[PDB]
Design a protein around this nucleic acid. Structure first.
Ligand code: NA
Ligand code: NA
Ligand SMILES: [Zn+2]
Ligand SMILES: [Zn+2]
Ligand SMILES: [Zn+2]
Length: 327
DNA sequence: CATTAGA
DNA sequence: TCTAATG
């Protein structure tokens, strides 16, 4: 956690680089498991050979481990870090919609900068166009203060549209968080569950309302259950317009709402921990349900959930407010 | 690990 | 159809 820190950090840098700059899923996979185990190792690694005894650590990494222990650096790391091509890919990739694949491509053609991106907006698809457009605004955290206004809006419209809608804003924001990255709204409705062969309109009506009053300003991807756009609080009385925010809305079969809400609310750690617990308690938890375990090794039969409670009850835990879902 | 664009 | 990108 701090004993194997640089080691695991160097390893991750290395890993990540294989994967993006080059396309060596293998090495890239190498560094990762390695970085994974040395991370667990409960002792201060004092040398390569010592490391080496680890599962996943072979001679290559061992060597890196030595150089790094020996001199506080690494050559390949120094080299990479400097490498303009690689720097370039790492950067382009920051545009929402630009992944490694495309990043490499552009570079190839020679678009290495944000400005390059501009004169070449033609080479870019819709998503990427929007990502380019709100590059600054997207990089910005969302102050909770704003979160409350946004939530405020979405709730009112949702409701005006149909009163049968149930929406919950998940994420860190749900957990108390001072700021958040984007708004996640989980939605479900009664007339829509596991069976009841869809009802696309259900998601669409709402998106439509939202855009209607100018909350949603762009569509990154809209399908029949997941809408991915951009929103913005009305830039009030001039002098201060708001930053364009990322928003995601998902439609859920009402019969698997709370599992989902449970899930998305996190945190990753509360999850895993909540999940690990369900197991002893003789169950299984996932993004959509909770099924009792059966001795034959496994089992199914999706238990009926009416609120975040029932799930707790099931695994017979203490209801933990979202606020304290931290781990 | 699942959903959407796109070519 | 696959393969990318977001989560
Ligand atoms: Na080994
Ligand atoms: Na990106
Ligand atoms: Zn020790
Ligand atoms: Zn989020
Ligand atoms: Zn999100």
């Amino acid at each position: 956690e701090t004993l194997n820190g640089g080691i695991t950090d160097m390893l991750t840098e290395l890993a990540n680089f294989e994967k993006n700059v080059s396309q060596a899923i293998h090495k890239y996979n190498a560094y990762r498991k390695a970085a994974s185990v040395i991370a667990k190792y409960p002792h201060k690694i004092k040398s390569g050979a010592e490391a080496k005894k680890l599962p996943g650590v072979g001679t290559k990494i061992a060597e890196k481990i030595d150089e790094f222990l020996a001199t506080g650096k690494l050559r390949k790391l120094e080299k990479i870090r400097q490498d303009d091509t690689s720097s370039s890919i790492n950067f382009l990739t920051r545009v929402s919609g630009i992944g490694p694949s495309a990043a490499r491509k552009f570079v190839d053609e020679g678009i290495k900068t944000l400005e390059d991106l501009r004169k070449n907006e033609d080479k870019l698809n819709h998503h990427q166009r929007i990502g380019l457009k709100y590059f600054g605004d997207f990089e910005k955290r969302i102050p909770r203060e704003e979160m409350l206004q946004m939530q405020d809006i979405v709730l009112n419209e949702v409701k005006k549209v149909d009163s049968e809608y149930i929406a919950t804003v998940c994420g860190s924001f749900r957990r108390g968080a001072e700021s958040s990255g984007d708004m996640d709204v989980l939605l479900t409705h009664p007339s829509f569950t596991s069976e009841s062969t869809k009802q696309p309109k259900l998601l669409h009506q709402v998106v439509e309302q939202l855009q209607k009053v100018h909350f949603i300003t762009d569509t990154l991807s809209k399908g029949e259950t997941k809408f991915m756009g951009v929103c913005q609080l009305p830039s009030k009385n001039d002098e201060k317009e708001y930053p364009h925010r990322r928003i995601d809305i998902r439609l859920i079969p009402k019969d698997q709402y709370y599992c989902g809400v449970l899930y998305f609310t996190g945190s990753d750690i509360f999850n895993k921990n909540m999940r690990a617990h369900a197991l002893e308690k003789g169950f299984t938890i996932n993004e959509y349900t909770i099924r009792p375990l059966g001795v034959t090794g496994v089992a199914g039969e999706p238990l009926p959930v009416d609120s975040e409670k029932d799930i707790f009850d099931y695994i017979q835990w203490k209801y933990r407010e979202p606020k304290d879902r931290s781990e």
